[PDB]
């Protein structure tokens, strides 16, 4: 059915007003492009944007500049990405499917979200990923220590979709024992019996941090 | 000092004339864009293009359409990438630095090649790579089996630069015992005491296979 989306926007870090999500892409902040995807999606009930308190005013101003039909809440985060995601998930008001999504990934398609909601509802946890295409090596001090075996390796994207109860439990367990995950899926993996499934996404679902990313973004738009 | 470059162009596979390297990028085949990089590079002595015999005529026609100052030889390859690279290295006429390079990586910069020649000459073997930015997971039947620990992982590019004697030895040893490597560095790694170093490259040094790659290419050009 429907979902809430939590987007961590605390910078896991820049000074107030200088969030990487405010970098303009064809004249609109990256975050705007991302927000419009979830706004136009019929099954997205609400957007939870997890922020640093200092940047609240900047986000408020930005949202008044760009109004949306879909409800958007600014929820204060913490000092790490995981802590922030969890404070976000604490603002979901009933049991339902929850997505967690990178603000700087504006090219997610409603098709992919739909497929991810189906899996999360079916089995509890799902992530978007694509096959790794390049050889991967582990390297100590610019010296190759090994070549990682490529056959079944996937590059992980967002969103990641979960039953709220499940992801909440995975966050609580992790926090109670001081485990620091990378992405949300790794918290579920860390639980006993915890299981996560993959929906294959698209190579266009890129994350925009650096200026070369903008250039690649501007070409994905125009196309 | 100077080097030969071997470029495997046997399709490790398409029918004759339909090589992926003939896909036109702003009106010139991808291979042309790549060849121009090595042609304009003062230290490149020779280009060895390893082909399927069937496509010889197509390559010959393509080269007469685009003349180059730098000498280019068409050398017949084998049925795998490794076998083809090795037949290529067999046409290098004296001991020197040899590069091996993907035909479909046209955005290599002379700066990067220069840094790679320095390392290969210094320590014997060098590769271009960039830090992995995304979470990597191993996945069986769309089901995550593990999260690969990210801190020291690099995505490997070409070229890879070696002392000819060293890479030749690594190829001979591998063939004598039927070992099938992925890239050339993995053949050197497989030798006793074999050691390979990393030069950090650039995120623009992309490989062009799919149509989305073209679009990303056309934007890297224009920029």
Q: How many CB pairs under 8 A join A and B?
A: 130
Q: What is the resolution of this structure in A?
A: 2.3
The CA-atom distances, in angstroms, between B202 and each of A64, A77, B22, B155 are: 39, 33, 24, 11
**How far does the CA of residue A82 sit from the closest CA of chain B (Å)?**
15
Q: How many domains does chain B have?
A: 1
**Cα three-residue angle A88-A106-A169, rounded to 5 degrees:** 25
Determine the residue of chain B that is closest to A221 in CA distance. B215
Residue B145 belongs to domain spanning: 1-223
| Chain A residue numbers touching B195 (CB-CB < 8 A) | 143-144
Pairwise CB contact (< 8 Å): A134 & B155:
yes
Pairwise CB contact (< 8 Å): A139 & B156:
no
Pairwise CB contact (< 8 Å): A197 & B137:
no
Distance CA A124, CA A185 (A): 11
Distance CA B112, CA B201 (A): 7
SS (H, E, C) chain B: CCEEEEEECCCCCCCCCCCHHHCEECCEEHHHHHHHHHHCCCCEEEEEEEECHHHHHHHHHHHHHCCCCCEEEEEECCCCHHHHHHHHHCCCCCCCEEEECCCCCCCCCHHHHHHHHHHHHHHCEEEEEEECCCCEEEEECCEEEEEECCCCEEEEEEEEEEEHHHHHHHHHHHHHCCCCCCCHHHHHHHCCCCCCEEEECCCCCCCCCCHHHHHHHHHHHHC
| CATH (domain of B170) | 3.90.550.10
**How far does the CA of residue A213 sit from the closest CA of chain B (Å)?**
9
Pairwise CB contact (< 8 Å): B189 & A143:
no
| Chain A residue numbers touching B132 (CB-CB < 8 A) | 136
């Amino acid at each position: 059915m429907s979902y809430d989306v939590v987007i961590p926007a605390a910078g896991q870090r820049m000074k107030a007003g200088r969030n990487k999500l405010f970098i303009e892409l064809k004249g609109d902040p990256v975050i705007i492009h991302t927000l419009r995807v979830f706004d136009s999606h019929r099954q997205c009930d609400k957007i939870i944007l997890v922020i640093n308190e200092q940047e609240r005013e900047h986000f408020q101003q930005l949202l008044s500049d760009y109004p949306f039909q879909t409800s958007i809440e600014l929820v204060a985060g913490g000092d790490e990405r995981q802590h922030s995601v969890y404070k976000g998930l604490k603002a979901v008001k009933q049991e339902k499917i929850v997505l967690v999504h990178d603000g700087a990934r504006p090219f997610i398609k409603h098709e992919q979200i739909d497929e991810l909601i189906a899996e999360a509802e079916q089995t509890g946890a799902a992530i978007l990923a694509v096959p790794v295409k390049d050889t991967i090596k582990r390297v100590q001090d610019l010296q190759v220590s090994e070549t990682i075996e490529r056959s079944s390796l996937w590059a992980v994207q967002t969103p990641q979709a979960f039953r709220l109860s499940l992801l909440m439990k995975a966050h609580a367990e992790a926090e109670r024992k001081g485990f620091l995950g990378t992405d949300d899926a790794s918290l579920v993996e860390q639980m006993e019996g915890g299981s996560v499934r993959v929906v294959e996404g698209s190579y266009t679902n890129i994350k925009l941090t650096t200026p070369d990313d903008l250039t690649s973004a501007e070409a994905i738009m125009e196309s």
